[PDB]
C-alpha cells in the first residue's frame, strides 16, 4: 500500500545530493568565493561545458578538450584528405599539458561534427603508427540525418598509450568502410576535415 511520505524522501535526497557533490569532488569544505574573477565565465570554459553537455569510478573527473592540429599544418601534407579518408592529428604535448600522467586518464572521446547525410554511411576509425601503419579502432554505421550531429569515439586506451608511449604528433584516420567487393569513398562532411577534438576526463593531479 501507500505508506511513504514525499517530503521526507525529498529532503533526504537533497542532503544525500549535497554529500555526494562534496564527496565526489573530494571537498572537505565548499570552495571560498573570495578570489573569484569579478566577471562572467571565459569562452573556452563555456565551450568546454557546452561540449560536455552535448548529446552524441565514483569521483569527479576533470574535463579538458584539446582541438586537433589545424589542417593547414605541415603534418597534413603527407596525409592529404583523400576522397575515401580524412586525417585528424593531435599534438600530444597539448594532451600531456591537459593530462600530466597516463594513469590519471579515465576516458578519452574523439568528437566530430558530421554535417549531413542523404544516405547511411559505414565509416571506420584507425589510429596512426610511427611506420605509416594503421591499426583498426572502430566502426560506426551513421544513419542519414538532416542536421549536424556530434559523433563520439571511445579512444581511452589509444590516448593513454599516446600519453605514455606517444610522439609529438599522433592521430586517426576516418575512412569509408571498404569490403572485399570494391572500393568506396567518404561522402560524410566534417568541418575543417568547430574542428574535431578530444574530450579527456582524467583524475586531477591535486586529487591523484
Amino acid at each position, epitope marked *: 500500500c501507500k505508506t511513504i511520505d514525499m517530503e521526507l524522501v525529498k529532503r533526504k535526497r537533497i542532503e544525500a545530493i549535497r554529500g555526494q557533490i562534496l564527496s565526489k569532488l573530494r571537498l572537505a569544505s565548499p570552495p571560498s568565493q573570495g578570489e573569484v574573477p569579478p566577471g562572467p565565465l571565459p569562452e573556452a570554459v563555456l565551450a568546454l561545458y557546452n561540449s560536455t553537455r552535448d548529446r552524441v569510478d565514483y569521483y569527479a573527473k576533470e574535463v579538458t578538450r584539446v582541438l586537433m592540429v589545424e589542417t593547414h599544418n605541415e*603534418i597534413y601534407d*603527407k596525409f592529404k584528405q583523400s576522397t575515401h579518408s580524412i586525417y585528424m592529428f593531435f599534438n600530444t604535448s597539448e594532451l600531456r599539458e591537459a593530462v600530466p600522467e597516463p594513469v590519471l586518464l579515465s576516458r578519452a572521446e574523439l568528437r566530430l561534427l558530421r554535417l549531413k547525410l542523404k544516405v547511411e554511411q559505414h565509416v571506420e576509425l584507425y589510429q596512426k603508427y610511427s*611506420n605509416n601503419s594503421w591499426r583498426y579502432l572502430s566502426n560506426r554505421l551513421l544513419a542519414p540525418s538532416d542536421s549536424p550531429e556530434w559523433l563520439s569515439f571511445d579512444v581511452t586506451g589509444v590516448v593513454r598509450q599516446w*600519453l605514455s608511449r606517444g610522439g*609529438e604528433i599522433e592521430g586517426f584516420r576516418l575512412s569509408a568502410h571498404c569490403s572485399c567487393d570494391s572500393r568506396d569513398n567518404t561522402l560524410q562532411v566534417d568541418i575543417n576535415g568547430n574542428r574535431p577534438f578530444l574530450l579527456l576526463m582524467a583524475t586531477p593531479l591535486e586529487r591523484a
Partner: antibody
Amino acid sequence: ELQLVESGGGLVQPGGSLRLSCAASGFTFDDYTMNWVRQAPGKGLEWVSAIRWNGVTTYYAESMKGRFTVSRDNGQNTLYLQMNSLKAEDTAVYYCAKGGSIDLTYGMDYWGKGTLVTVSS
Amino acid sequence: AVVTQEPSLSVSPGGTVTITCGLSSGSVTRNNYPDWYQQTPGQAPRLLLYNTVARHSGVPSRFSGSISGNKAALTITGAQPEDEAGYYCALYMYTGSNNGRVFGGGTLLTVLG
C-alpha cells in the same frame, strides 16, 4: 634490410666545405625524418641537424645554425649535409640517423657507420 | 639550456642501476621526449628507449625508463656484463630559435666483471 651508408668525410683546411652524403636502402624517406649527429673523437654525441619527410623545414643546433645546411633527394633516395666554413672544433665522426616518425620524436632508430671529418691547418 | 648528465657509473653484474639526465634550467617532462641510446666504443649508437618508456625492437626488457623527479631516468635491472657502454640521453626541447634534440654527456657505465 635496414642500411645507411655515408660518404664525403675527409681532411680539409679550416674554413673549407664538405658535402656529406647518406644513401639508404630498406626503408622510405617519404615516411621518416632524417637526422645528422656528430661525435667528436673522445667526447660525447652531439645532435647536428634534422629534416622532415619533404625537406621544406629543417632543424639545426645553434652551434651550427646558418653555418650548416641539410637537404634531401627523395628521388635519388639520399640525404645531404653541406658544411661550410668549418672551425677547428668541427672535426668529428658524423652519423646519419633514421628517425622513428615524421616528427622529431620517436628517437633515432638506425644509425650509419659515420664518416670521420677532420679539420686542421 | 644544457642537458646535465652525471659522468660515469659502476654497477655489479646482476644489480640495478639508474642513469638520470636533466635540464639545467627546467624540469624533464614527457614533452621533453627523452631518447636513450647505447654506444659501444668504436660502434654506432643504438636506440634503447624512446618516448620516455618505449623500448626499441630488440632491446632487452631489463631496460626501462621513467620521469624521476625532475629528470629522466633509465633503469637497468640485472645488469648483464655486455651492458658496459656509453649511455646518452637526447631531450627534445626548444633551443635558441627552433626545436631540436640535445644530447647530454653520457655515462660510461662500467660493469665490474
